[model samples]
Target chain A: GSKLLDEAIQAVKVQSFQMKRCLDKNKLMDALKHASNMLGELRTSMLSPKSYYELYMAISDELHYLEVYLTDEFAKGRKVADLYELVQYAGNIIPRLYLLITVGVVYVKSFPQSRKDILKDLVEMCRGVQHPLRGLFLRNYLLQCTRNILPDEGEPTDEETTGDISDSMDFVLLNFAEMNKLWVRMQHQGHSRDREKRERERQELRILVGTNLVRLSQLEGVNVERYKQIVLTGILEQVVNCRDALAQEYLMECIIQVFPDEFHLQTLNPFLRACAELHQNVNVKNIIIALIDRLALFAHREDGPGIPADIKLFDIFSQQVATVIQSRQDMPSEDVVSLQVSLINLAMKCYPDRVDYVDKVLETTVEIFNKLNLEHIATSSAVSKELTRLLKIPVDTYNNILTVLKLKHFHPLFEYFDYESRKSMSCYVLSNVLDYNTEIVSQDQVDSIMNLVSTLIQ
Target chain B: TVADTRRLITKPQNLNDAYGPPSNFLEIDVSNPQTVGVGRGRFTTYEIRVKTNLPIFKLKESTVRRRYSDFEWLRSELERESKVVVPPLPGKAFLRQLPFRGDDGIFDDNFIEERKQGLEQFINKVAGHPLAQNERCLHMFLQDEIIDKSYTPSK
Candidate 1:
C-alpha cells in the first residue's frame, strides 16, 4: 500500500467518526463541515498522485450518518435541492466537491421534483479530477452513490421501458471515456525513468475504471442490440485506438470477462473484428483465450440453453483464427503461439461429443506451425523453446480429446508437432488416452500407444 | 526435537535430504476440495500437504494448496514432457453445475471431499512412480511453494 493512502485512511477515519457526532446533536451544518474537512485533511497528508481507492472504502461506513441525516431531514425540503448547489461552493476543490456529490445523489433521489437535469448535471460535474488515481476514485464514489438511481433495468416496473435504457447507457459510457483519458494520461506524468512504477499503479486504477462497464451491463434491458450498436461500438474503438498495449490488453480482457456470455456471443464478431484492428503487438490470443474460456463455461451453465442454430461460436473463431494466421507478417511470434494455445484450450473444453473440434484445432495449429516453417525457430529463440510446451495441452483435456477422436483418426495431427527439440508432444496426451500412466504401459494399448508415437516420430 | 535434530545431523548417505533420487518419495494429505469465496470469485482449492524427498524440488516439505485447474496444468506438463504415461486424474474441464442436495449446493462439503479423495490418490500414485518421480513437471507441481533449497536435475 502507498504511504499516502495509509495517512489519509487514518486522518479520514478520525473525521469519519467526528462528522457523525456533529450531526448527532442536530448540528447539520457542523456535521457537513466535518465530512468536508475529512477529505480536506488529505490536503496536508500529501497522498499518492496514483492511490487511495480503498481509502475511500475504508471510511465509507462513516458516511452513513450523513446519508441518514440528509434522508431524514431533507426528506421534504426545497432546502434539499439547495444542498446540491450549496455544497459546491466550499473552498477546497476535492472535499467540497466530494461533500456536494456525497450529499448531492441523496438529494436527487429524495427530492420530490426528481428532475433528470439534476442527475445529468452532477454526473457531468463529477468529472473534475484529472489525476488518474484521484479521478478514478472520485468517479468511483459517484458511480457507487448513483447505483440505485440509474434508470431501471430488466422486467419493466410499471414506468420502466426500453427507451430509458439507452439514455443511462449513454450517460455511463461518456463517464467511462473521460475516466480512461484521465487513466491513460497518468503514465506520462512521472519521470521517464519511473515509467514502470506508473504503469503498475495505473493498472491498479484500471479495475476501478472497469466497474463502469459492469454497471452498463446491469442497466435494465441493455440487450444484445444496445450492447452491439451503442455500447461496444464506443468501447472497442476506445480499446483499439488507445494504442498503449498494456491498458488495451487488460481493458479488453476486462470487457470479455465482466460482461455476460450471451452478450459476448452476440458481439464476438465485432469483438474479434476489433481485435484484428489492434496494433500487431496486442496479445489477441489473450482476448480469445478469455472469450473462449467464458464461452466454455457458457456451455455448462445451470441454465442449459442449447447453442442457437444460427450461431456457432466455434465457426466464428475458427474462421477468425484462419484470418489472423493469414496476416502473419504483421503478427509477432508470441501472438501466433498464443493463438495456438487458446485454440487448444477451446477445443479441450468442448463437450466430449464435440471432441473432433479439438482434433481439428490441433491439426490446424500444427498445419500452420509446419507450413510457416515455424518449427525452424525452435532452437533459435526463447519463445520457440515453448512451441512443444504450448502444444502439450494439459493431460485431462488432451486425453479426453484423444479418447473422443479415436487412434487412427487423430494420428495425422501429430505430424504438425514433430521436432528434434520436442518428440511426441502428443505422446503424453496419447498415453493418457490409452489409459496408461507415465514412464510407460502394457499390452494391446501398448501396441496402440507405440504405433501413435511412431507415427508422430516419423 | 532431540531425535529429529539427531536424524538431521546423521542422515543416511544415499538419503541425504528427501531430495536425491534414492530419497525421492512424497507423502500427501488430501483434504477435500472445498469451494470458498462468493459469486464469480468462488473456486475450490484442494489443500494438499506433500512431504517429499525430491532434492530437485528445492523444498524439503511443502504445503501446496492448488485447485483442480492447477492439477490440470501439471498433468498437461507431465504428459508433454514425460516419456512414461502421465498419472491419471478425473475431469479435465472446470467443475460444472451439479443438481444440489447438500446445503451448499455445488460447493457442498461432501462433494468436495469426494473429489479431494480422488485427487489425493491421483498425485500419490504419480509422485510414487519411479519414472514419474524423475520427471521435471512433477517436481514443479509438488514443489511450487518451495520452503527451502533448490534441486535441478540434469536435462
Candidate 2:
C-alpha cells in the first residue's frame, strides 16, 4: 500500500513541479517548505507496494534534483562555517535535517574545529522522526548528506584529528546500528498480514540500507589491518544482532563486494568465524560460495605469476573450517549443512582432482553428522521436507554415483537409518521434485546432502 | 556478580545445558526499556538481551525486544498455573507527571533502566523458582519468539 497519500501519480507531479518553481525563483525557504510539504505526504497507505514504490521513486527523483543545489553550494570554494548554520535554520525535520546534514558535512571538512561536534550533533538529531518510514528515508537522506565525513591528509600534527580510524569506525558504526534498528522496527508496523506488501516496499528501499556499507567502504584511510580490527568487528556486530534476514544477507553481500579480494585473504579467519555463528536458516553458504569463488579466482587460480606471495587461501579455509566445526556444535543441522556445503565448495574449487581434500570436508562433517540427532528434526518437519531429503539421499549416494562412491567406500554412511522414515516418503518426495526442480542440485553439491542423510540413516 | 545462582554474561563451559529454563536459564539482562514513537501513540519496550552458553531459541546473540506489559501478562499466566507466590511488579505513583517534564518523563533513561532492573530482578526470581521455572508462561516469556505481542489481561 502506498503509505503516503499519493493516490494518483499526478498528485506528486504537480507538487513536484510547483516546488521547483519556488526553487528557481530564489524562494529557497518556500521551495523547502513546498518540498517538505510534498515529502510529508509519504505514508505506507493503501496502494499496491509496486505502485507505492514507483511513486516513492518518483518522489525521490525530485528530492535528489533538489540535492544537486546542496551539492553545488558545498563545492564552490565555500567556507562551511557560514553555510553550516544556514541549513540548520531550514524548516521541518523531514527536510530540515536532510538539509542540515547536507550543510553539516561540508563544515566537518572545510572547518575541522567543529568537525566532531558537527558530525555528532547531526547523528543525535537524526532521531526526530520516531515514525519508521519517514525516519528511515530521513536517515537515508542523512547518510547521503553526510558524505566526505572524515577529512584525510597524512601528516598528523597532533593526535586529536578525526584521523583515528578506530574512532571514526565507532562513530559510523553507532549511527548505522541505530539506523538499522529503525529500519527493522519499521517491518513490524500496521496490520500484521501486510507483510508481503510491506516486503515489496522494503525490497524497493533496501537501496537506503545498502548504501551504509558503500559509505564505509569509501571511508578515508581504510586498510586490511583496520578492516580486520575495526571494520569487520563492527559490521559483524550489526549482522549478528539484527536477526533480520534481509539485513544479514544484503550486508554479507556488501561485505564481499565492497572490499578488494586481497583484503578478504587477510581477514578470512575472523570473517568466516563470524559466518559460522550465523542465524540458523541463513543461506550463508551462498555468500560463502561467493567468498570462496572470489578467493579462488584471486589467490589460487593462476597460481604462478599474479597471486599474492603471502596468501595461501585453501589452508586458511581448511584450518578455519576445523575451528568453526568444533566451535559450532550447538548449531542446528541445517546450519552445519550449509557449512558443510562451504567446505565442499572450497574443495571442489581448489582441489578438484584430490578426493582427499573433499574427504577432509567430509571427515569433520560426517563426524558432526554422527552426533547430530536428525530423528527429531525430520519427525518435527512436514512430509515434503522429510520426503525429498530421504529420497534425495537414496538417489544421490546409491543411484547417482555408486561406482565412484563404492571406490570411495561410503558404506558406513550407507547403512544410516530411520529408513523407518521411508514409510510412504517418496510420493510427497517428487511432488516437490517438479516444484523444486529448479534447485536441481547436481552431484558435487550433494556432498553435504549425503552427509545429512547418512547422519539420519545411521 | 561472580558465580551467582544465575549465569550472567559468561560463556557456557560445557554441554550440561539441554536447553530449558531450569538446568539452563540464560541470563536475562533486561535493559533499555524505553518508549518508541512520538505523540499519543507511544508505548514501552524492554531489551531482553540475554547471555548464555546455549543458543536459546535462535536469537543466540541477538537482543530479543520485549515490553513490560508482555511480562505482566506472563506473570498473570504464571500466577494462574504455578503454585508459587509470584513476585509483585513495581507500582507507579499517582499523577506521576503530565506532558512529561524531563526527557520522556517516567520513560526517561534513568527511570527506564531502573524499571528494567526491578523487572529483571522480578523475572530472575520467578524464573529461578523451582515450581515457576517449569511454567509455560515463563518459557513463553523467556524463550519463545511467537509470544511477542502484548498479552491481554483476561482468561
Candidate 3:
C-alpha cells in the first residue's frame, strides 16, 4: 500500500511537471486544461475552503491568461475561437463572467458590426448571474462596450435597420438605467439614519453613474441630442422626482459638469426650468444654483471676455433664470438670493478683464435683492448669508462699482431718499445698505460726510 | 573536439559568395479587368524583360531555364484546379536546354542541400509558431462572432 501511494504521488508530480513545461512553451490552453483537471480532482477529494480557494485561483489565472492572449492575438488579427469555447466550458460563475466581459469588449472593439450576435448571447447569459453587485457591474460594462453602435440623429433608415438600431439602443439604455437604479439602491441597502453618511454614499453612486453618462456621450457616432434626452429622461428626471436631497444634489451637479458644451445651448434652459419645478429639497436647490453658476461661468469664458458680442448669450442666461423663478413662485426667497449671488459670482469671474459690465449686472442684483426684501424675511437666512458672502469677492469688482458710485454718488442717494419717503424709511435704509455700500460713513464721521454729500444732491 | 568538428563543417567558403537574382526587378503591369476584357474576351497577357544582379543567372541560357519549372507548375495547377482555361507558358521549350548553376561557381549537391535546409527553416518559422500562424488575418476576418447582435442587420 505504501509503495502504491508513492507511485500515485510520483505520477501526479510528473503530470504537474509536464503541465509546467507546456506552460513554459506557451501552450497556454493545454496547460490551463491540465491545471483545471487537476483542480477538479482535488475538489472531489478535498472539500475544504483552502481547496476551494485553490480551485478558484487556478481557474482565474487560466481565464486571465486566455483573456490576455486573446486580446493580443485579436488585436493582431488572429482568431481565438478555441479560447472562447474553453471559457464557455468553465464551470464557475465568477471566472465565466470575467471572461465574458473581457472577450466581449475585445470582440466588439475589433469587429463592431459583425459581433452583434455574440454580444446578444452574452447579455442573455448575464441573466443567469443575478448577484446584485456582479450583475450591476457586468451590465454597466456591457452597456459601455456597445455605445458606439448607436445611430446618429434624424438619419433616415429602412425598417429592418431601424428596428435593429432601436433594439440595440433599448438594450443598452435599459441596462444602464437599471445599473444606476441598483447603484442608488445600494446606498439604502444598509440601515443608517445618519444623513451625512447617506449623502456621502449617494454621492459616490452619483459619480459612478455620471462617469458612464460622460462615456456614453463620447462614443464615436452618438447623437448629442439623443444622449442628452436619454440621460435626462432616464436618470436625471427620476432622481429629480425622488425628493432625495443627496441624490438630487449630486446628479444635477454631474449633469452640469459633464454635459457636452453643445447641449448647453439647446437644453440648459429647459433642464433648469424642470429642476426648479420638480425639486423642492434644499440640497437640490443648492446644487441647481451651483450648476447654473457653473454654466454661466462656462458661457462667459466661452466668449473670451465676460461680455459676449453675441446678444443671444445674455438673452439665454437672463431668460433661463427668469423662467425658473416664474415657474416656481413658491420657491424659498432664500434660494432666489443664493441663485442671484452665484450668478453674480460667475459673471465677475468670467469677465474679470472688463469692469464696465459690472454696473449693468449690479443694477439687476440690487433690484432682485430689494424685491426679495431679503434682510427682513426671517426664513431668508440663506439670502442674508449670501449678502454677507459677497464681501469676500476680489476687491477689483467692488472697486469699479465704488468708482462709479463715488462719481454719481448723489444720484443713488437721492433715489434712496425718495424711496425712503415713499415706503418705510427703515426698510429703504436696509435696502440701500444691502444694495450699495453704507461703509462711507461711520457713526462718528456721518455728520461731516453728509454735509459734503448734501451740497451735491441739493 | 565535437565543437571544433561542427565549426569545421560550417566554415565559410569564398566560392559560395556568388549572388543570384537582382534585388531590383521591374514590375509587370496587368491592365485592369475592364480594359483587359475589352481587348480579349477569354484572356489577357503581359511580360517582364529579364535582368539580374547575379553574374551566374545573368547568362542568357540560365535566365531562360530559371523560370521553366515555375511555368510547368502554373500550367499543371491551372489545368487541374481552375475552371477558367489558361494558355500554356510561352518560354518553357526555349528554357529546357540550359544547364543549372549555383552560387559556388558551379552547381553541387552540397550547395543544393544547404539551400534546401535554409528554405525549410524559413517555412518552419513562418508556419509553426503561434505568433507566426494565421499570417493572413483570419481571426480579424471572422471576429464578428463576438460582436453585439443588436447592431447587425437581420438577414
Candidate 4:
C-alpha cells in the first residue's frame, strides 16, 4: 500500500523534473495531476504533522515549478483555462486554492476582460475555506499571488512579452488590502474563543501586512495615493483602533515607513484624530506617539538644525500637536502620556541641538506623570518592550536629546523609568526640545540642561 | 530610439547608469535571432550579438586582475559580498568557454556563479592595470574589435 504512495510521489518528482526542462504545457499538466494524486494518497496514510508538512512541501514545490512555467509561457495569451479547472479538482482545500490562485494570476493578464469576474470568484472561493490555519495560509497566498493584477495606468507596452508584470504588481497591492481586512476580521471572529491566540495571530498578520507594504513601496510604478487609500489607510486606521499592543506598534511603524512622506505631513492631523477618537486601546495611543515622532524626524530632520525654514511643515505639525493635546484633555493619563511623548519627540526632531520647547513638553509630561501618579500606573511588560525598541534608534539622535537636556554626563537615570514610560517620555521630551529650538545649544549647556530636567523631574 | 540603442552598444553601462553617472555600459541585442541550418543534417544556432563601451570595458577588465582583494572594501562596507566579484573581459585573443549544460542540449545559464567569477576576473584584469584603468574608450574598442567578431556555438 505504501509502495503505491511512494510510486505516486516518485512520479510527481519525475514530473517536476520534466516540467522544469521545457515549456511543455501538456507535460506540466500531467505532472500536476500526478503530484495531486500522490498528495491524495499520502493523506490516506494518517501521516504525522511532519510527514504531512513534508508532503505539502513537495506538492508546493511542484506547484511552484508549474507556476514558473505558467508565468513565463501561459501568461502571454496562451490559453490555460483547463489548468485552472484541473487545479479546482484537487481534494485538499489548501492546495486547490493555491493552484487556483497561481493559475489565476498566471493567466489573468492574458484574459484581461475576465479579470474582475475571475478575481471575484477566486476570492469568494477562498472565503469559503475558513479554518484558522488554512484561512491564514489561503488568505496569505491569495494576497501574495494576486499582487500584480490591476492596471494603474494605461495598457503596458510589449503586451505579449511583458505578460502580467504590471497586473501582478497591482494584484499584490489589492490583495494585501483584502488580506489585511480578512486578518482583522479573524481577530473579531476568534475574540471569544481564545483571546490570546487571536492576539498572537493578529500580531503575525501585522508583520505580514508590514512586510507586504514595504515590498509594495519598493515596487516600480506603485501609486502612493492609491496605496494609501486602498492598502495603507485601512490597515493603519485599524492599527490605531486595535487593542493588541504589538500589532498596533508594528502596523504603525509600517505605516510610517511605507506611506509617502508627504502623505504623513498632509494627513497627520486626521490620522492623529482618528487614533484619539476610534482606538480606545491605550497602546494605540503610544503607537500614535511613535508615528508622530517618526513623522517629525522626516519633517524636521532631527540630526540637523530642523529642516530649512522654507520647508517648515514642522511648524504646522507643532501647532496641530498642541491643538490635539488641548482638544483631547479627557484622555486617560496613559493616553495623555503617549500623546505628550509623541509631541515631544516631534519637537526634538525639529531642533535636535536646542531645548527651546523642552521646558514646555517637560512641563506637560511632568504634569501628566504627576497627575497619573507615575508610581501607580500599572506598567506593562509589553510597554517596556516598546520603549527598548526606541533605544535602537541612532546614538547621535539619542545623544542630541541627552545633550540638549544637559544630562550628557549623568549616570543612566533613565534606567528607573518603566519601558513604556521611558520610551514614551524620553523620546517625547527629546523630540520636542529638538523640534522647537531655533538655535543650537552648546554641549556644555546641554549637559547642564539635562541635569536641570532630571533633578526637576525627581 | 535607434541612436539610444547604438549608444547602449557603444557605451555599455551598469543597471544604475540609467539614473546615475555612466560608470558601465550594456549591450542588448535589438534583433535577437534564432537560426536553424538547412539542407544536410539538422543544425541550429541562437545568437545574440552585443558590444560594450570603453570606460565600462576597462573597469570590468581591470577588475579581473586585481582579484577579490581590491573589492573587499566595498564588500565589507555593503555587508554583502555576494555581488562584488570582478568580471573578466571576454577574450580578445581566444574564445570564451560557455559554462552551462542542461537537459535541452546546452545553453548559457546567465546567473551561474562561475560565469560571474569569470566576468569578475576579466573586469578586474582590465580595471587594475594603470594603463587600462578608468579609460572609457578601451571598452568601446574591445567590444567593437574583439567580442563583436567572435562566434559562439551551442553544444
Best by DockQ: 2
Ten consecutive residues with minimal summed lDDT in candidate 1 chain B? B1-10
Error of 3 at A270 (Å): 2.0
For model 1 chain A, the run of ten residues with the poorest summed lDDT: A154-163
State the lDDT of candidate 3 residue by residue for A1-458, as single tens digits. Answer: 23533443444455556666775786866765555544333223222223333443444445445455556767887665645456556786544555555566566555545354555555556655544344554565555445554444444443333224444544554555555555555444332345466555455445445656665455444555665665456655455544454555666676677666566555666666666655445454565566656656565554443333543544455567767676664777556656655655655665555444444445565676556543343223454455434423423244433333332222232232232232332233334445765555445335434543454444
What are the candidates' individual DockQ scores? Answer: 0.01, 0.02, 0.00, 0.01
In model 1, what is the error at residue A276, expressed in angstroms?
1.6
Query: B95, model 1: CA deviation in Å?
Result: 81
Best by TM-score: 1
Candidate 2 C-alpha lDDT tens digits along A276-380: 666655666566767877765654546544445466556777677556555544545555565555566565555555556555555565566576554533434
Error of model 2, residue A309, in angstroms: 8.0
Docking class of 4: incorrect
User: What lDDT score is found at residue A399 in candidate 3?
Assistant: 46
User: Could you list the CA RMSD of all candidates, in the order they appear?
Assistant: 26.6, 17.1, 29.8, 26.9
| Candidate 3 residue pairs in backbone clash | A79-B139, A114-B144, A115-B147, A115-B148, A116-B147, A116-B148, A116-B149, A117-B149
Query: Candidate 3 docking category?
Result: incorrect
- The alpha-carbon RMSD over the true interface for every model, in angstroms, is 31.4, 18.3, 34.7, 22.7
> Per-candidate TM vs. native?
0.63, 0.54, 0.48, 0.49
Stretches off by above 4 angstroms in model 3 are: A1-65, A74-94, A109-113, A120-131, A140-172, A188-202, A223-238, A241-244, A277-279, A296-335, A346-385, A391-395, A398-403, A406-458, B1-155
lDDT by residue for model 3 over B1-155, one digit each (tens)? 00010112234222112111123222111111111243223222222123223222223211111122333443343344333344433332223223553332212345334433433343223223343222222121112222232332211
The list of candidate 2 runs beyond 4 A from truth reads: A1-12, A43-56, A70-91, A105-117, A148-171, A193-204, A244-246, A300-341, A351-355, A362-458, B1-155
- The fnat of each candidate, in order, is 0.00, 0.00, 0.00, 0.00
